[PDB]
Amino acid sequence: CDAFVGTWKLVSSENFDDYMKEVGVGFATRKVAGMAKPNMIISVNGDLVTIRSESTFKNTEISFKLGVEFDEITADDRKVKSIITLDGGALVQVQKWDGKSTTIKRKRDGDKLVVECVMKGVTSTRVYERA
Amino acid sequence: CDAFVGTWKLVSSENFDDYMKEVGVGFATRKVAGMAKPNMIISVNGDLVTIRSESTFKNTEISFKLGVEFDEITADDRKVKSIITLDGGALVQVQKWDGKSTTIKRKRDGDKLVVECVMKGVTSTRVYERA
Ligand SMILES: CCCCCCCCCCCCCCCC(=O)O
Ligand SMILES: CCCCCCCCCCCCCCCC(=O)O
């Protein structure tokens, strides 16, 4: 995942609040999340990939091996089971919790890193550029 | 309600999608509603006040006597019981349906007409100016 390594800054967001609505995130949390312009930091050490999201009010970090299911506490505090695989040059993440699931794809588009989140038909697209 | 009579055009909206989310409006309907820039038309004939909302995809109209509960079919198709009273120079509407309720206040602010909608703590503010 060499094409993903680096620090990325959010440049645009589309339908993110609707996605969080669908995920079940509370109003207050949605408002904070929407004000935040996080920096995504991706690094690789051996077979362990680390994705870190930093924002003034909440930093999240997940370290994982591609293909191995792991426990993740999301920014909105959901305890989920996540699995991330490398498919077609994109990092495809599936989070499962309480019989529900959502997919988060991180892919390269030109010189940008695009993150697409899908929850029951609702799709959010967030574009990042290198910091 | 002479200060309300006229045709008004939407100039700004705040937290409207969040309000509709709280009300339980579906994703598709929320998207259409958000694209719309309706014209509000208020008129009075005797003791009957008529509030009409016009938009490319949905026109709504309610005629009522201040203080008398009536049936209303909302734009998002809810069948509610509405009561509108004149309090402090503002038109205060309460809609009740399935054990729930929401308040919609229409008031004058300077040369503008402000509509505030409240649903379980979530407040939306839409400002209109004369057309
Ligand atoms: C105290 C609030 C902190 C922020 C809370 C955010 C709540 C929503 C979390 C959604 C996580 C999945 C979306 C990630 C989007 C991205 O990678 O840019
Ligand atoms: C086919 C879709 C048409 C539009 C559907 C709108 C759905 C939400 C209706 C909310 C009604 C109460 C808010 C009124 C706001 C205002 O007076 O400007």
UniProtKB/Swiss-Prot annotation, chains A, B:
It is found in: Cytoplasm; Nucleus. Forms a beta-barrel structure that accommodates the hydrophobic ligand in its interior. Its main location: cytoplasm. It comes from the Eukaryota. InterPro entries: Calycin, Fatty_acid-bd, ILBP, Lipocln_cytosolic_FA-bd_dom. The modification N-acetylcysteine is found at residue 1. This is Fatty acid-binding protein, adipocyte. Changing residue 30 to A: Abolishes ligand-induced translocation to the nucleus. The modification Phosphoserine is found at residue 12. GO terms for biological process: brown fat cell differentiation; cellular response to lithium ion; cellular response to tumor necrosis factor; cholesterol homeostasis; long-chain fatty acid transport; negative regulation of DNA-templated transcription; positive regulation of cold-induced thermogenesis; positive regulation of inflammatory response. A fatty acid binds at residues 126-128. Lipid transport protein in adipocytes. Binds both long chain fatty acids and retinoic acid. Delivers long-chain fatty acids and retinoic acid to their cognate receptors in the nucleus. It holds the Pfam family Lipocalin. GO terms for molecular function: hormone receptor binding; long-chain fatty acid binding; long-chain fatty acid transmembrane transporter activity. Keywords: Acetylation, Cytoplasm, Lipid-binding, Nucleus, Phosphoprotein, Transport.
